[PDB]
Amino acid sequence: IIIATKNGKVRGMNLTVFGGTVTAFLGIPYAQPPLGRLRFKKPQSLTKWSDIWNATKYANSCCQNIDQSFPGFHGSEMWNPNTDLSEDCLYLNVWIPAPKPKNATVLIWIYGGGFQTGTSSLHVYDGKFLARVERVIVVSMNYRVGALGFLALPGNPEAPGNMGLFDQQLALQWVQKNIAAFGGNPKSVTLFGESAGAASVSLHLLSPGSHSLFTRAILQSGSFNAPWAVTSLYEARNRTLNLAKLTGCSRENETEIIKCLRNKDPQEILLNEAFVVPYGTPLSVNFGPTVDGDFLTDMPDILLELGQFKKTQILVGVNKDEGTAFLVYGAPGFSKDNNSIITRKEFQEGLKIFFPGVSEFGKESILFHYTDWVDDQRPENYREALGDVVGDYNFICPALEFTKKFSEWGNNAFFYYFEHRSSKLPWPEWMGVMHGYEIEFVFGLPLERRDNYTKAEEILSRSIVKRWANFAKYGNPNETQNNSTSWPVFKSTEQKYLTLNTESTRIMTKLRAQQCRFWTSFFPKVLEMTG
Amino acid sequence: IIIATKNGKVRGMNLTVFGGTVTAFLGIPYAQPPLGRLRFKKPQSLTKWSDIWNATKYANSCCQNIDQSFPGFHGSEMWNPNTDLSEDCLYLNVWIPAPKPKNATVLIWIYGGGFQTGTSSLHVYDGKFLARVERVIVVSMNYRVGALGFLALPGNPEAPGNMGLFDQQLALQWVQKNIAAFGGNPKSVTLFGESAGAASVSLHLLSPGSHSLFTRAILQSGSFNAPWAVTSLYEARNRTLNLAKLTGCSRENETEIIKCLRNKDPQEILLNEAFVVPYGTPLSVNFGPTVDGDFLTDMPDILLELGQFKKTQILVGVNKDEGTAFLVYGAPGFSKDNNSIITRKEFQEGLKIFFPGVSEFGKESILFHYTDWVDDQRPENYREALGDVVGDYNFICPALEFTKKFSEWGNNAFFYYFEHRSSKLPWPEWMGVMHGYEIEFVFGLPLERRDNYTKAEEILSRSIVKRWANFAKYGNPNETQNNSTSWPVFKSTEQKYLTLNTESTRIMTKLRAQQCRFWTSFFPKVLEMTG
Amino acid sequence: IIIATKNGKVRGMNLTVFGGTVTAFLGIPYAQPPLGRLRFKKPQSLTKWSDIWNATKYANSCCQNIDQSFPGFHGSEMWNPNTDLSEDCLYLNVWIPAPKPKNATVLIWIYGGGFQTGTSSLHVYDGKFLARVERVIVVSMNYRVGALGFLALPGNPEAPGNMGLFDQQLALQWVQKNIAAFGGNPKSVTLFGESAGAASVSLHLLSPGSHSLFTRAILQSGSFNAPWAVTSLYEARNRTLNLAKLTGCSRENETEIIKCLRNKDPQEILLNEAFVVPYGTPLSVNFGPTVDGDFLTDMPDILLELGQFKKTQILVGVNKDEGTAFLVYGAPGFSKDNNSIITRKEFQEGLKIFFPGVSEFGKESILFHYTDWVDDQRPENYREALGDVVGDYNFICPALEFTKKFSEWGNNAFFYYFEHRSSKLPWPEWMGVMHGYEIEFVFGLPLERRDNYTKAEEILSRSIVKRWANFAKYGNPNETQNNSTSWPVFKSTEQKYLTLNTESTRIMTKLRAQQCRFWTSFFPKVLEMTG
Secondary structure (H helix, E strand, C coil): CEEEEECEEEECEEEEECCEEEEEEEEEECCCCCCHHHCCCCCCCCCCCCCEEECECCCCECCCCCCCCCCCCHHHHCCCCCCCECCCCCEEEEEECCCCCCCEEEEEEECCCCCCCCCCCCHHHCCHHHHHHHCCEEEEECCCCCHHHHCECCCCCCCECCHHHHHHHHHHHHHHHHHHHHCEEEEEEEEEEECHHHHHHHHHHHCCCCCCCCCEEEEECCCCCCCCCCECHHHHHHHHHHHHHHCCCCCCCHHHHHHHHCCCCHHHHHHHHCCCCCCCCCCCCCCCCECCCCCCCCCHHHHHHCCCCCCCCEEEEEECECCHHHHCCCCCCCCCCCCCCCCHHHHHHHHHHHCCCCCHHHHHHHHHHCCCCCCCCCCCHHHHHHHHHHHHHHHHHHHHHHHHHHHCCCCCEEEEEECCCCCCCCCCHHHCCECCCCHHHHCCHHHCCCCCCCHHHHHHHHHHHHHHHHHHHHCCCCCCCCCCCCCCCECCCCCEEEEECCCCCCEEECCCHHHHHHHHHHHHHHHHHCC | CEEEEECEEEECEEEEECCEEEEEEEEEECCCCCCHHHCCCCCCCCCCCCCEEECECCCCECCCCCCCCCCCCHHHHCCCCCCCECCCCCEEEEEECCCCCCCEEEEEEECCCCCCCCCCCCHHHCCHHHHHHHCCEEEEECCCCCHHHHCECCCCCCCECCHHHHHHHHHHHHHHHHHHHHCEEEEEEEEEEECHHHHHHHHHHHCCCCCCCCCEEEEECCCCCCCCCCECHHHHHHHHHHHHHHCCCCCCCHHHHHHHHCCCCHHHHHHHHCCCCCCCCCCCCCCCCECCCCCCCCCHHHHHHCCCCCCCCEEEEEECECCHHHHCCCCCCCCCCCCCCCCHHHHHHHHHHHCCCCCHHHHHHHHHHCCCCCCCCCCCHHHHHHHHHHHHHHHHHHHHHHHHHHHCCCCCEEEEEECCCCCCCCCCHHHCCECCCCHHHHCCHHHCCCCCCCHHHHHHHHHHHHHHHHHHHHCCCCCCCCCCCCCCCECCCCCEEEEECCCCCCEEECCCHHHHHHHHHHHHHHHHHCC | CEEEEECEEEECEEEEECCEEEEEEEEEECCCCCCHHHCCCCCCCCCCCCCEEECECCCCECCCCCCCCCCCCHHHHCCCCCCCECCCCCEEEEEECCCCCCCEEEEEEECCCCCCCCCCCCHHHCCHHHHHHHCCEEEEECCCCCHHHHCECCCCCCCECCHHHHHHHHHHHHHHHHHHHHCEEEEEEEEEEECHHHHHHHHHHHCCCCCCCCCEEEEECCCCCCCCCCECHHHHHHHHHHHHHHCCCCCCCHHHHHHHHCCCCHHHHHHHHCCCCCCCCCCCCCCCCECCCCCCCCCHHHHHHCCCCCCCCEEEEEECECCHHHHCCCCCCCCCCCCCCCCHHHHHHHHHHHCCCCCHHHHHHHHHHCCCCCCCCCCCHHHHHHHHHHHHHHHHHHHHHHHHHHHCCCCCEEEEEECCCCCCCCCCHHHCCECCCCHHHHCCHHHCCCCCCCHHHHHHHHHHHHHHHHHHHHCCCCCCCCCCCCCCCECCCCCEEEEECCCCCCEEECCCHHHHHHHHHHHHHHHHHCC
């Protein structure tokens, strides 16, 4: 199939999905390759091409470090990129339902990965099933990550910060211009992202430049107000310097620093990245989003608090066990291979691992709050408390605080708590409903008879797939045909949310309410005290 | 730096503020010099210039009388102009934050000075700190004052009145046209002014011609409904005549009067100004705003009362001691050099000084209201009561009445009471929190480590600077990061306002409520009785 | 003074009013003279003229019968036209305040006279005072009346009906096009009319063609829902026929009837007019407004009842003694020269005079309702009851019913009851506050020192003049400077209205409430019974 975009024409492929057809356009460019001089700059636009672009295979993933903790292990490897890494990386994919629609609603995916890693071409981000099953156009794009995407010298047009975020934005501009040609409704565009793609999505809600490039937003396990998500103007500058130092690039003329950084080998940069922050944490975001004055005109906390954002509906949610994923990357006593029962003493070390620069006080308060239990000496007590600490603090509470502050200004928000463990999950039982493991179901992967998902899982995925499409199309994530109990609006007073599971599916209120009062009121007060 | 405006290009300068940079464009013209024939007429527009305008120093202040009561004394001299006086005076300044922004919010300052005096180039109106610290564009302009700015022959196009007000308006038109080129958002423009610049700002709220030239308004120690601010169609005409008389300019053909006035020496005019009103008052506005049919289409009292004004948010406030400044310019027993303890008998004379044409009744009511106290013979009793009389009557009560009537029609108003005395204040302790002495803090002057302001004052200024910027940017003067107690909306029923201080910062209600019931209901009734 | 309109230029005159100047443009044409072929057709537009039109004297009044009941008597003669009658009659006047305004609010006057008579050039419609005193532009126009203005053959484009109403509408179109040139705000246009000009104004509120030709409407002593105001499709046709008959013009081909009518002498037509309705009534509207399908798309009762009208503010009112004017034109026992004490028996005849085709029942109910009194044999009892019958039934109750039904759909209405008798009134004491005798005060006539109106009357007129201008300018007829008790909104539940007088000026409720329940519910039911 051949479609004409404003910069020349592209050829796609015909995929066969569930006795039917989806048209795929893998790897259309949307910007100039950010090579040579262009490294670290905002993405520059394309000029026309006279011929046809063969958009028939996934393009290059973007330059990033790979996870080598568990070689061969699917559980970690399914998250590693699956095409060649290249700075020549700014490409997007598009899936179209079976006969070209007329003005179909568009889902645009933004991948997570803590802003250091990730690609659009993972198996679990395959939007063919969504286009086939719900007749939506799905788009995903690749954006720069780590330093190549977020190195910042505050104000300097040679490295302004938030370049990965402009990448996303330029692919949003692409869709406004082009999706019409593909049979998509530029007026009906929904952003969905996970972890750092969720944070990304929340940023577009605040970003004036992004304001008219989409309609609604879905946010899965992340949001800008999370401890990990936004880097301060000071730290970004400090971290840029420490990089220069680590690569024999320190200068006087600031513009000369970028000049030598722009000449270093990609791999050279990638190697010293992990070493620019003083104390490791498994949740380290070495080069992330900053307040640049361009994409973000002000501290996001103020903007949110003063209702300066896109007014629209939003769907936000988290998983039962966001925190566990991280325990196996540095916390003592933890391993994917044993059932990781830990002792009070280890728990306390875990705490130092995850709260490196925090007062004896902070750490003793965390401990007191998560340690008040029905003891009976359940051996797992401490293993379970460390995960919940990590998850609550880093994902759940900020996601709940973001929903509150957003809904204060009038729009409908919907909140979900995803509590089902994939039968196929490569990681062990203890690790529960891990961060990242709803994506498979949103993307419809269990709808595929021929993988080994349960009937139950097929029903769950289907239902999720429908609620998400309905949110995108209609601004209301309901599932009107098979569903009992419709999904209620989150409102700051009552704070209702829906439970996503294979069994029950209940409507509940005030999620993790004690835990969030601790993390959002008490603990901040303790941090305040010790400098 | 070089920027192209619709009338040719201008060159600015690079200023270094707080380890960073602000781009200054001092003294860009925005109208034809109101010389020769053009004197007394509305400002005429500029035609293109082929070259570059060097906008690198403050232009001429506008023709006005200087204050020579305290020669050498900073307290009075900091208010005197600091460039040459010239009728060639219609120029504006602009400060831009460090790297050119993209669409920055604009603050446009309008200076006070009772409409007889003042310039945009005073040290305390330096908008470099606001652009650096909050990333706003600051604009200020010079406008004609006294007769050259407000001489009125009702309806006669040769001296229509309100020319100074058209001057302001033409600089507002300038910004709508040009600020885009400087990286400013023409849709996000906030007017702020003090004393007569506040009154000026309230007039633009009423002026149909000004209606789309800004977005919000901030009003510091003044408003059009103050006793001093608007001159009646009769008095303006009478005062024009007495001027002609005083300069041997009385004629028959009215147009011939302007012809000879248009030929007199600037200084000749300036000298007889003080002598056109029969009885002096230190709050004399010899040539002010009038109802001209053009800038103001009707008596402002009616317009306000019938909700015919720009509907928008507004921030309004006054100082603890507005009245004291004036006591040293004619009230017996008062001097900046002694602690001015006065006797009942002097107080009574003070009263005659400030209420020249008022019944024995008026004066005996004022006296009764301000004289009911916890006597113990505090020697300062009468000194304190005279200041409060002056302040209440002339600044506080009208500012409170204007806020009430405005908020009646639906928009959010915010009211402040500024109660901090600058540690640096040249005037003595007794004179308290003088009229004019918040400007320094709004403009961020205490943010400068290298002047001798206290840490406390640095925190106060910072907080004010933020609340003002937040009002301008977002329509909500909150300070979300460091502040406890947010600023509540003023509403006609409850009448809440915020306290600005180094210590407490409280939320209080109904300011000067007894005093204002006196000045706005009782005293008017007494005036009514005696002719 | 010379102004260019879209059809060439016009010259006005300079009038001197109250030590100041008003610019007058008397007698500008706005349509093609409806002569020869054009008689009875909608008004046709003008084509350009190359020169200057001398618009310096009132043009021809329109063809109508004159009132010869009281020759020489001012009371009746001030209502007779005061320029030559001509079919060449479609002209308009304009008064502009002293120096040309910039966008002044426009009052457009539509004269009353039961649709059979009246001109725009009466002394009491002189809009010079309104332009001088309130700085408004006043416009009035002449429109065809009686047969030449309202003869109807339902649907036939040769005599469609409502031509006088199109005349008005074409002068409204004129103002939209031209008033800008005169310094008037086409967006701020208020219609005011009396008696049949009030009815006219209410029709423009319903007329889709008129919908965007004005902003607000003022309605003095009349409204379309009055017994006299709208002629039924049947009666209009019948009355056209009886005219043909009376002028030897009956035919077969309907179009041939108009052909001979179009050839008859103007005076011939005028003479037989009074004779086309079977039974005289002093309130006879021989040729009025009808439902034509063009100006009025449906029965006005339905349109009003279903809220199909221009949504806007309106000011409506009546006089203490609307009915008396008519008693001297046919009711037995009545004369302007005696104090007209009448006997029950005469009253009963009066009733037959004014309710010609009504059941013994109707007449006995009217009688019972107006005859229940504090007898003491006040000799005037019956004289007073007959006037109130006439007034209530014909003016007050319909004006009250129209206000109710209008305000039901949301807009602010204001209702007034005018209760002051001009000291100058030519008619006798008994006749009270006659129909027609507020116009003088609205038009500001008592503001003229040099006529013999009382000081009290000067204050009353002034206040009215202000409230009307304020309604026109601001949609709120308040008088904020001198007035105690502001004018409340009429709302269908509480039904408040303001009293216009030299003494009291009170706010009261439910005017003539018993009387209107009779006229609007009970009496209609009695009419229903007898066929």
